[PDB]
Amino acid sequence: SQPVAITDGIYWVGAVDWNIRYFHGPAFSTHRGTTYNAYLIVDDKTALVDTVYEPFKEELIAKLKQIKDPVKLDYLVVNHTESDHAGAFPAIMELCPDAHVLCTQRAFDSLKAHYSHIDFNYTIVKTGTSVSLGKRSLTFIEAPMLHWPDSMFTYVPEEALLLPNDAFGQHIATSVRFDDQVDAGLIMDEAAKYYANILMPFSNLITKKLDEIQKINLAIKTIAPSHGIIWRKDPGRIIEAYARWAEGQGKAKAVIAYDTMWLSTEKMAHALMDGLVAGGCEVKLFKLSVSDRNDVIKEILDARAVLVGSPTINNDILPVVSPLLDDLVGLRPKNKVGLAFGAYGWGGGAQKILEERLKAAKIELIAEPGPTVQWVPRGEDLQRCYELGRKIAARIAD
Amino acid sequence: SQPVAITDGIYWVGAVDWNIRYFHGPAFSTHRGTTYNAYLIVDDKTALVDTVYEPFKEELIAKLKQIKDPVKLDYLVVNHTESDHAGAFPAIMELCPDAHVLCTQRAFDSLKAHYSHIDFNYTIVKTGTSVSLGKRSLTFIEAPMLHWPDSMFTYVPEEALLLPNDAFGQHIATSVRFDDQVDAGLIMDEAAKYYANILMPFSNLITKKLDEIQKINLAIKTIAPSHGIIWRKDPGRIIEAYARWAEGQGKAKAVIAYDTMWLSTEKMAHALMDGLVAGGCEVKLFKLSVSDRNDVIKEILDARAVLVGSPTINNDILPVVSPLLDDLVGLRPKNKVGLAFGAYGWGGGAQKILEERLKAAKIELIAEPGPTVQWVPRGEDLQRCYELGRKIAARIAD
Ligand SMILES: Cc1cc2nc3c(=O)[nH]c(=O)nc-3n(C[C@H](O)[C@H](O)[C@H](O)COP(=O)(O)O)c2cc1C
Ligand SMILES: Cc1cc2nc3c(=O)[nH]c(=O)nc-3n(C[C@H](O)[C@H](O)[C@H](O)COP(=O)(O)O)c2cc1C
Ligand SMILES: [Zn+2]
Numbered sequence: 001s002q003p004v005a006i007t008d009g010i011y012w013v014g015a016v017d018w019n020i021r022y023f024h025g026p027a028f029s030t031h032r033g034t035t036y037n038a039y040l041i042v043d044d045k046t047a048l049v050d051t052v053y054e055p056f057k058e059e060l061i062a063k064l065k066q067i068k069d070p071v072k073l074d075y076l077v078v079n080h081t082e083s084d085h086a087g088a089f090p091a092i093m094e095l096c097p098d099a100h101v102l103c104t105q106r107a108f109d110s111l112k113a114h115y116s117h118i119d120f121n122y123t124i125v126k127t128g129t130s131v132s133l134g135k136r137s138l139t140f141i142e143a144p145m146l147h148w149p150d151s152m153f154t155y156v157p158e159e160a161l162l163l164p165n166d167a168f169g170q171h172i173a174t175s176v177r178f179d180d181q182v183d184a185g186l187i188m189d190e191a192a193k194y195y196a197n198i199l200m201p202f203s204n205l206i207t208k209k210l211d212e213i214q215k216i217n218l219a220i221k222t223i224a225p226s227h228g229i230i231w232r233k234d235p236g237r238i239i240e241a242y243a244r245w246a247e248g249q250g251k252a253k254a255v256i257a258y259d260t261m262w263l264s265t266e267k268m269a270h271a272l273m274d275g276l277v278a279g280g281c282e283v284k285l286f287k288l289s290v291s292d293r294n295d296v297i298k299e300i301l302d303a304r305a306v307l308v309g310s311p312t313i314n315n316d317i318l319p320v321v322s323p324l325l326d327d328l329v330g331l332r333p334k335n336k337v338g339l340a341f342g343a344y345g346w347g348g349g350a351q352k353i354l355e356e357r358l359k360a361a362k363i364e365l366i367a368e369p370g371p372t373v374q375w376v377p378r379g380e381d382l383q384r385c386y387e388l389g390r391k392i393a394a395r396i397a398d
Numbered sequence: 399s400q401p402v403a404i405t406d407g408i409y410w411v412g413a414v415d416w417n418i419r420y421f422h423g424p425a426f427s428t429h430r431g432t433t434y435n436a437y438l439i440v441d442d443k444t445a446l447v448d449t450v451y452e453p454f455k456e457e458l459i460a461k462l463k464q465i466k467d468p469v470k471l472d473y474l475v476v477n478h479t480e481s482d483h484a485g486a487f488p489a490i491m492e493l494c495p496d497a498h499v500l501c502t503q504r505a506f507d508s509l510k511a512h513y514s515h516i517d518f519n520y521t522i523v524k525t526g527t528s529v530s531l532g533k534r535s536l537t538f539i540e541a542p543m544l545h546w547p548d549s550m551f552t553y554v555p556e557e558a559l560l561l562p563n564d565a566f567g568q569h570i571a572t573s574v575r576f577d578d579q580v581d582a583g584l585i586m587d588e589a590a591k592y593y594a595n596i597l598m599p600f601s602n603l604i605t606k607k608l609d610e611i612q613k614i615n616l617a618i619k620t621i622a623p624s625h626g627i628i629w630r631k632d633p634g635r636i637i638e639a640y641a642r643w644a645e646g647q648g649k650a651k652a653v654i655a656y657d658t659m660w661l662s663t664e665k666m667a668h669a670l671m672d673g674l675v676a677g678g679c680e681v682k683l684f685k686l687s688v689s690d691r692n693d694v695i696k697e698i699l700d701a702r703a704v705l706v707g708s709p710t711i712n713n714d715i716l717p718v719v720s721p722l723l724d725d726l727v728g729l730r731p732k733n734k735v736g737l738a739f740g741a742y743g744w745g746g747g748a749q750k751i752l753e754e755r756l757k758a759a760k761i762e763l764i765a766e767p768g769p770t771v772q773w774v775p776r777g778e779d780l781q782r783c784y785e786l787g788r789k790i791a792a793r794i795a796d
């Protein structure tokens with residue numbers, strides 16, 4: 001209901017989605033819901049940056065009328081189209097027909113494909129362009145593939161305010177809006193879960209756009225993403241985190257995701273971790289069929305090692321392990337070392353599948369044919385897994 | 399607690415697992431638990447067929463002492479070594495060290511591998527071989543790869559009793575023991591869920607073994623499998639069923655499994671469905687992220703068509719779909735036609751992975767490059783899917 005002011009004239013007018021437990025379809029789990037943020041700037045000429053997820057258009061409009069009775073809206077910025085952000089696009093245009101749309105090219109094309117039948121004045125914007133609203137203007141910065149092709153940021157220099165959309169956001173539902181009103185530790189963890197699951201494969205593009213904003217000495221006093229809390233107090237903190245995560249130097253940490261039918265593969269898992277811990281390396285042990293794939297990925301962003309295990313069923317992998325694997329192949333973990341392991345009763349087959357997938361994800365296998373075992377692990381075997389983890393530990397060194 | 403007599407001198411001494419929900423580890427889901435059946439034959443020389451999942455050894459032993467306290471046990475037959483069956487091997491072997499183990503060769507090897515530190519007077523068995531216990535005797539039938547290499551059935555001619563272990567079994571926990579004491583419809587569906595998820599890839603060996611028993615003209619009056627109910631009143635129906643499923647003639651049915659992020663792919667799934675129903679086909683629609691892969695696989699057993707859709711994320715398939723794909727490749731569905739489909743926003747990529755996996759599962763694509771959409775379905779797009787479902791409907795004809 002109640003809109004929130006970032007500063008005199010600039011307001012937060014999005015909606016909070018408290019009960020959503022899954023975003024991007026069944027992909028990103030939102031244990032704590034999320035929010036669709038939209039920003040209104042009231043000047044001689046008023047602008048609305050991004051909209052809201054369709055099912056929440058009511059709350060948007062309501063918050064809008066909460067600032068000014070008949071909604072003016074001279075400009076309508078669209079940094080992204082996705083849906084969670086442009087779903088209310090139609091509702092809004094019908095509300096303010098003559099509103100002027102400013103966006104990237106691919107954004108315009110996308111906007112035309114996901115809606116059409118919707119007439120509107122536009123004006124393709126490019127990185128560096130600039131429109132004025134009076135006392136305040138709004139320059140832009142193209143942000144291709146920083147999630148999507150049509151992606152871009154919106155910078156209001158007059159207040160050193162940045163509106164990067166999806167980037168720098170976190171999927172959290174809260175009645176509070178700013179980072180100084182949330183636990184510093186918990187909010188950053190969410191920020192990491194978002195990065196790990198969305199921006200992981202675009203790390204290099206990220207370091208780039210980052211340095212770019214630095215070369216231009218853009219004064220970023222506050223960052224207001226399209227999901228979650230608005231970084232008002234310490235915005236340098238996530239800028240720096242992103243910087244760190246994007247480089248991916250990592251920490252002497254190792255994630256072991258796996259699953260088993262009769263425990264043989266599990267034992268191999270303990271042995272690997274026991275050796276890894278001995279090498280002075282932290283370890284996260286995830287039994288896939290009872291762990292959040294999304295949380296497992298978040299843990300990997302930081303780890304310098306990834307070990308996946310599974311026995312073999314019908315000459316193939318254990319289905320439960322498939323999701324993690326293909327999700328890794330698409331996310332492409334920047335600079336990582338890993339291993340594959342598991343048991344079998346006669347022929348095997350999981351090990352090849354695992355190693356091909358792992359290699360496809362660009363994970364440097366610390367020992368090509370990984371530790372496989374027939375039926376049950378033997379002492380010599382567990383010892384082998386032990387030293388192997390011991391070996392990985394030493395490489396992740398730190 | 400109490401044992402149940404199948405007939406004078408022959409008792410059910412297994413254990414019922416009411417709370418289990420995931421058998422074979424995270425693989426097969428048992429919405430209604432299961433049982434680990436074990437049978438005791440009291441003749442001039444009492445014998446035990448299989449044991450029980452370790453965690454229920456006390457129950458087994460407890461039940462044995464209830465037939466004859468000082469536990470005799472001249473022979474101990476290991477029809478299968480899996481674990482849900484041989485877990486209490488060491489326990490029963492300690493109870494009676496002097497026991498004569500009867501098993502296959504591969505069984506023996508597995509047994510010596512899974513246990514060792516346990517010696518026992520054995521004697522490899524082969525098809526036809528026969529051991530006498532007095533009035534009653536017991537002949538064995540090797541059943542290689544009928545689930546596992548060491549698999550085999552135990553036949554008691556005097557009673558026309560067949561102890562096939564896993565084959566003909568269903569994962570279901572009931573206080574009652576025989577088929578005539580259970581809903582024919584519900585029990586046969588479980589029997590199918592079992593076959594569909596475990597024996598599906600051995601259909602050919604199934605018909606052959608069934609025929610072999612047909613030649614030998616074995617008199618099967620009752621079938622007591624290792625899991626579930628005991629076919630006492632009508633073994634014919636389950637044998638007919640297995641024979642049918644094994645052939646794989648199928649039914650003019652089609653299973654469409656998929657998942658999406660923003661619906662486009664869902665819409666395609668629908669289009670295809672309509673065209674199929676129009677073609678006079680029965681359809682089952684499954685949004686993978688909300689369905690049981692095991693329940694889905696059960697449905698495919700009868701189906702003559704398998705369609706799998708998915709959008710494309712990070713140039714790969716949506717992780718949620720991975721499981722089905724990999725479970726199918728391993729399961730190798732006999733005589734099935736299929737089609738892959740889905741949307742993309744710019745590059746695409748899930749279609750190749752889909753057709754790749756689908757082919758690898760030995761599924762005949764009705765149209766190599768399957769239907770694909772960019773962003774949102776258009777009129778012709780859906781019409782196209784319609785026609786395609788219409789085409790598959792035509793081929794599955796019946
Ligand atoms: C349904 C089922 C199917 C199996 N298929 C294969 C197979 O194709 N090839 C193989 O080498 N082992 C197969 N096995 C044996 C397992 O790979 C072996 O028991 C292993 O020790 C299990 O590892 P775990 O205890 O970590 O689950 C199969 C086991 C089960 C229960
Ligand atoms: C996290 C995310 C990642 C994506 N990655 C790709 C990609 O690599 N290639 C592509 O062509 N489209 C990509 N898309 C776009 C979707 O394929 C496209 O929006 C499609 O219309 C969604 O299908 P659906 O409505 O069935 O969920 C991506 C979308 C999201 C939200
Ligand atoms: Zn709200």
Ligand SMILES: [Zn+2]
Nearest residue numbers: 399400457460
């Ligand atoms: Zn009891």
Ligand SMILES: [Zn+2]
Nearest residue numbers: 668669671672
């Ligand atoms: Zn319809």
